[PDB]
Write a protein that binds this ligand. Structure first.
Ligand SMILES: O=c1cc(-c2ccccc2)oc2cc(O)c(O)c(O)c12
Ligand SMILES: O=c1cc(-c2ccccc2)oc2cc(O)c(O)c(O)c12
Ligand SMILES: [Zn+2]
Ligand SMILES: [Zn+2]
Lengths: 167, 175
């Protein structure tokens, strides 16, 4: 409401940037295929933590030729990119048929979705269909047309939107 | 369990289809109990700018779009404003279902306890210790202080208990 929005944030925050959104993923083989092949993201970096039994995969809309190859240069670059998706893999969940993650849209709710802006929701979704992508909401379904939701291999919801046709 | 080799992981990566060339990662949506508390936290404490507020009286919810953007860049015309808001990179979408603020029975799940899923958003800052010193002075609740545990990396909580990572890209290459 009216007073809650600070319009003159302290200058010590002026260089803060929204660097990542982290989601836990059961199987990086499926997740990496989906985010790179279907949605066109690039894998920036894979970090492994043997002592803690997990790996991190950082994906973003970045040109792979921009990514430094030396692992130390790569690390500083990856963490200074805007809008990365951090996928956390706890070792062994792929081979654990008892295990799966919660997408936040049913009890208990919290997290809702990530969202990707695209030039053409209908063409993009037509391609998603041809690729066998699972839909939550097709662009025509529901009546808030021209907006879609698809699901990644863990069942997380991804909004597919056009900024001009939201209006 | 041993985790993927680099070779396995990279072999599951395809190059992007040219039809996705202009796709951008636009938003992360979180549900929020109290918009007064949340907007104060994200604008005043973390310095994001509220790009736009949308109200849907028929359905009894509101949306808040926040981002690290120059407030002077926001268009005045509401058609211009919506297309600009929705084409900004890395925005935070906060969804408020009306009335949750004054229901002491209600709260949202931050994803970090059973059943797990979502973990956090993360903000890169010039100096984690300086940022956290201010957070401490502003009464921010911490999950992990930078000195405690992986020094130089922190986690704080927003008013719903969502975890927010505080990191310095120039020092994270040190564990
Ligand atoms: O409920 C929503 C309604 C509208 C909307 C915006 C402009 C004109 C008409 C409808 O946009 C949205 C965008 C989102 O990213 C989202 O998660 C949403 O739930 C909505
Ligand atoms: O466990 C983590 C370890 C490291 C790390 C990075 C460089 C050198 C040493 C350790 O970075 C992280 C970054 C994140 O965004 C995150 O959610 C994490 O859990 C970690
Ligand atoms: Zn993280
Ligand atoms: Zn959304």
């Amino acid at each position: 409401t009216a007073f809650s929005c600070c319009s003159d944030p302290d200058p010590s925050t002026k260089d803060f940037l929204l660097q990542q959104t982290m989601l836990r993923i059961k199987d990086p083989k499926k997740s990496l295929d989906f985010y790179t092949r279907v949605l066109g993201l690039t894998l920036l970096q894979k970090l492994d933590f043997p002592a803690m039994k997990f790996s991190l995969y950082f994906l973003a809309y970045e040109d792979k030729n921009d990514i430094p190859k030396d692992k130390s240069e790569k690390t500083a670059w990856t963490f200074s990119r805007k809008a990365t998706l951090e996928l956390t893999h706890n070792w062994g969940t792929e081979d654990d048929e008892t295990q799966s993650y919660h997408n936040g849209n049913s009890d208990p709710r919290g997290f809702g979705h990530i969202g990707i802006a695209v030039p053409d929701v209908y063409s993009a979704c037509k391609r998603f269909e041809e690729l066998g992508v699972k839909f939550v909401k097709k662009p025509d379904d529901g009546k808030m047309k021209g907006l879609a939701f698809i699901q990644d291999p863990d069942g997380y919801w991804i909004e597919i939107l056009n900024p001009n046709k939201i209006a």
